[PDB]
Amino acid sequence: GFVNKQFNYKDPVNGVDIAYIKIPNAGQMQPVKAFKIHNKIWVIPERDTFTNPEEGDLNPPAKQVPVSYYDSTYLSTDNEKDNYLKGVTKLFERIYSTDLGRMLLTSIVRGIPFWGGSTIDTELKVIDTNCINVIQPDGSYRSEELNLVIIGPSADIIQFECKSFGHEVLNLTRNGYGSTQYIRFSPDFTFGFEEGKFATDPAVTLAHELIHAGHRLYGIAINPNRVFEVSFEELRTFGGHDAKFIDSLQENEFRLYYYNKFKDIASTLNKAKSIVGTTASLQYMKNVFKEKYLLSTSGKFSVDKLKFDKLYKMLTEIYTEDNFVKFFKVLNRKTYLNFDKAVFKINIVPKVNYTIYDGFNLRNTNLAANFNGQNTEINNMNFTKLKNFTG
Ligand SMILES: O=C(CCCN(Cc1ccc(Cl)cc1)Cc1ccc(Cl)cc1)NO
Ligand SMILES: [Zn+2]
């Protein structure tokens, strides 16, 4: 499938897909064991105390809404790290099992962040923050380009997000460039909603984050200071009825702003005369971007409007949490905002508990009908209710 190597946390390092790495945090970090599960995608089974050294403490503060959960010990043992890795891999395979999921992951892999790191406007150069440093046998580090990192949560165990390292001048997630995305996520816990008490399928939560990743990799994310209190980026990602709270005129304004940023990238490509890096042919990197941005006898690049509009709508309207819900054939909350306040400990790793094809709604069993697999009372053995953080 999507992840052809069924990695174990204990597997020895090989420096190609199982290696100790440093993320571009801009601080001195100890190297952590990471796993390249697919091309351009790594998984770090560690609590996220690296992406933002300011939030390196796993102690609790309580956050009113959404619901929160704190454990300072979760994801500290090798066995938890193994289960985390297997849990994330299973969810990647669950997403990939769908046509929409297969599409989104392919779009993510092609979404290489733009080589806009040079001082000279005619020179292409990778931006350091879009790379990881991979340890070699002699202790030196080699720079590796990547699109996506799945990382364990920071202090609030159930606070999941798609974040990335910024630039001093450039707004990478809003200028068309894109930047490497870090998703804080855990397959080991889920949220309950009401419709009757049901649990959110973690593949839906993961697909949600990969939708933000998709936007941010293509540099088309909606500024987080554009709200409704809910950001347009969040409404768009969730989709369904909630996405329609973004008016037609704001939607056209964004569509046009990004046709223009894609125009600027196509021109930067056309003016490029040089390239930094050893294994980095100028024509190879022009083709990477040509493939990513779906650009159109002389080598001069252009933005086809019908291709742009198709690609833009692909990322912003087809890749939505709502459509993944329809594809996974599961039950999910009706609106993005949800104040139910119910957290459940889960184990989706065993086939007896959760499968790539049915999720918790196992076929040919009492759980296949009426989303009983997601019913926290019917399938009570699959969901251990935890105490919500209060103080
Ligand atoms: O979108 C996010 C954050 C997670 C979204 N949450 C929904 C939410 C609920 C209440 C408020 Cl005030 C704001 C957001 C988590 C969430 C998911 C499922 C459920 Cl059932 C409840 C909460 N990250 O990309
Ligand atoms: Zn979100």
Side-chain angles (χ1 to χ4, degrees):
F2 184 79
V3 181
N4 291 320
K5 286 187 173 171
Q6 330 309 310
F7 299 113
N8 289 80
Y9 191 69
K10 302 241 169 79
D11 289 350
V13 311
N14 53 54
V16 153
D17 46 25
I18 308 163
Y20 270 81
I21 73 157
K22 284 187 175 232
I23 74 160
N25 65 341
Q28 294 95 35
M29 71 176 266
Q30 308 268 21
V32 293
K33 207 167 188 277
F35 308 86
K36 188 192 207 156
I37 62 156
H38 185 91
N39 189 36
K40 304 284 174 176
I41 314 189
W42 294 73
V43 165
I44 311 176
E46 291 296 328
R47 292 295 290 282
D48 183 22
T49 57
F50 319 99
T51 73
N52 190 2
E54 203 212 340
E55 47 197 327
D57 188 6
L58 303 169
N59 293 3
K63 298 151 74 178
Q64 274 263 17
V65 283
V67 67
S68 52
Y69 186 85
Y70 297 83
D71 203 340
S72 74
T73 63
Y74 161 69
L75 209 55
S76 53
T77 80
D78 274 18
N79 302 324
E80 278 176 290
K81 290 167 168 174
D82 187 57
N83 213 64
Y84 177 94
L85 185 58
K86 291 174 173 177
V88 172
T89 297
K90 200 186 204 152
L91 297 172
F92 264 93
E93 300 286 28
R94 180 126 158 91
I95 286 149
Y96 192 72
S97 71
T98 65
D99 293 320
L100 180 64
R102 182 185 274 259
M103 274 157 84
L104 169 70
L105 294 167
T106 306
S107 281
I108 282 157
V109 173
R110 287 161 93 106
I112 285 106
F114 193 61
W115 278 34
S118 183
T119 271
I120 299 110
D121 62 319
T122 70
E123 178 182 284
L124 286 196
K125 189 177 175 182
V126 68
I127 294 160
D128 78 307
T129 49
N130 298 331
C131 296
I132 58 162
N133 280 329
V134 181
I135 204 153
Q136 291 170 139
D138 42 48
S140 62
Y141 282 85
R142 61 158 192 90
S143 185
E144 196 171 307
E145 289 146 29
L146 59 90
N147 293 3
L148 188 64
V149 174
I150 311 299
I151 200 167
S154 175
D156 177 2
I157 274 161
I158 58 164
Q159 176 239 82
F160 305 144
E161 73 175 306
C162 183
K163 55 152 67 222
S164 48
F165 302 104
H167 188 265
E168 288 307 288
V169 165
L170 303 153
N171 306 264
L172 306 176
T173 62
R174 314 189 295 269
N175 75 346
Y177 284 30
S179 52
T180 297
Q181 300 303 306
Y182 289 69
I183 292 174
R184 283 182 179 171
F185 174 76
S186 169
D188 305 314
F189 299 84
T190 199
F191 308 85
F193 61 94
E194 288 191 349
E195 200 42 82
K197 228 293 207 325
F198 293 93
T200 307
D201 186 323
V204 166
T205 308
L206 183 57
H208 175 98
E209 299 312 331
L210 293 178
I211 296 147
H212 287 304
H215 300 153
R216 298 163 70 91
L217 273 163
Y218 286 80
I220 64 159
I222 299 166
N223 196 314
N225 70 47
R226 298 225 62 172
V227 296
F228 188 94
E229 56 288 337
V230 52
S231 78
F232 287 155
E233 175 64 24
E234 284 303 354
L235 297 166
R236 166 203 257 191
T237 302
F238 189 84
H241 191 203
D242 272 21
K244 290 139 179 73
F245 284 103
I246 307 167
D247 61 317
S248 295
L249 177 63
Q250 233 105 248
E251 208 110 52
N252 274 263
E253 155 201 294
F254 293 135
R255 193 154 288 124
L256 233 94
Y257 185 89
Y258 296 120
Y259 179 76
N260 277 81
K261 289 295 195 294
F262 277 35
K263 269 196 166 195
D264 305 333
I265 286 148
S267 67
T268 295
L269 284 172
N270 288 346
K271 300 173 278 186
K273 305 276 177 285
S274 66
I275 189 149
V276 175
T278 50
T279 56
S281 166
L282 181 51
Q283 203 79 284
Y284 181 94
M285 294 309 296
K286 270 169 137 180
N287 200 80
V288 164
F289 298 124
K290 166 188 195 178
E291 284 239 277
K292 176 191 172 175
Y293 300 104
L294 276 64
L295 315 170
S296 295
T297 48
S298 61
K300 186 187 183 73
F301 294 136
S302 60
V303 290
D304 196 58
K305 202 193 176 172
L306 301 144
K307 282 167 124 64
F308 169 80
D309 289 323
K310 202 261 284 293
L311 176 56
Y312 189 82
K313 276 226 174 189
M314 186 62 68
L315 295 148
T316 67
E317 294 179 14
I318 309 308
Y319 306 158
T320 61
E321 181 181 340
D322 204 71
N323 298 334
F324 272 97
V325 168
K326 303 184 178 253
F327 267 81
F328 294 130
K329 293 179 179 179
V330 301
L331 198 64
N332 206 60
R333 74 195 195 282
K334 296 292 184 289
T335 189
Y336 174 80
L337 278 75
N338 187 284
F339 329 99
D340 275 353
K341 287 214 297 108
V343 181
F344 303 92
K345 182 69 190 75
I346 67 177
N347 200 353
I348 68 137
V349 163
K351 191 186 188 171
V352 205
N353 284 326
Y354 182 100
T355 56
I356 292 140
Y357 291 115
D358 316 303
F360 288 114
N361 291 317
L362 287 170
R363 259 158 15 197
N364 300 334
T365 66
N366 162 71
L367 309 166
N370 307 297
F371 317 102
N372 291 337
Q374 289 175 273
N375 198 296
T376 53
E377 281 162 343
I378 287 157
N379 197 11
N380 58 68
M381 291 291 101
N382 268 290
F383 311 104
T384 311
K385 180 112 144 66
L386 303 167
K387 293 179 179 179
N388 319 311
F389 190 70
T390 56

